[PDB]
């Protein structure tokens, strides 16, 4: 489950 990053 690949990380989801919003920066």
């Amino acid at each position: 489950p690949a990380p989801e990053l919003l920066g």
Partner: antibody
Amino acid sequence: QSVEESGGRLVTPGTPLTLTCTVSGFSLSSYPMNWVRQAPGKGLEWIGGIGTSGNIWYASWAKGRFIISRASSTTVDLKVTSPTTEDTATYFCARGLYNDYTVWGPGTLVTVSS
Amino acid sequence: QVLTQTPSSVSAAVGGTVTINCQASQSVYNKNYLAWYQQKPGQPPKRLIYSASTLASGVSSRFKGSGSGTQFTLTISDVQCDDVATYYCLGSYDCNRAECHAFGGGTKVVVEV
């Protein structure tokens, strides 16, 4: 590359209000986009954002109070579903938030009062 | 995740040093996804530092970020009058596991002459 917020105004509590973030000089779908607010004299608070995935995320506290969407090829909106006096704040949008492409708008002021 | 900054206010001498602490209730992504922001009245926040210790392009080397996991520090050296501002830490996380972002509550910096 820049972003600019619009739609900030005086609204009576309970009246739906939509703010818009307009992007210039980049593709909205190629970067994360975020909404952040700041009540007068108070701290920055992350509301939510859109990943490059297209997934739309909210802060715990913002759930049920705000809806974010890709409104056009060049805009992301933030709808405040039922504003209260505690939603009085400047609302910022940003491309990113920590990476080197991060850029913020000047903010748009929402005043919730009768 | 909730981030707590201490102190909430600093009054420091020009040419001195200020230390601002940030504690995260849970470990940030990769142990280092913690950014620092500077904001002046009526202006958008300006990114100073990302990944705990990486200075953002255009920023003065007087700003230094340190720490890891849940405990982080911003140090402003050779404090200048134009450092008067509020400073915020920003913790970021895998959205699949935690709040994507959380800001600290801010630390106001004022200078003494």
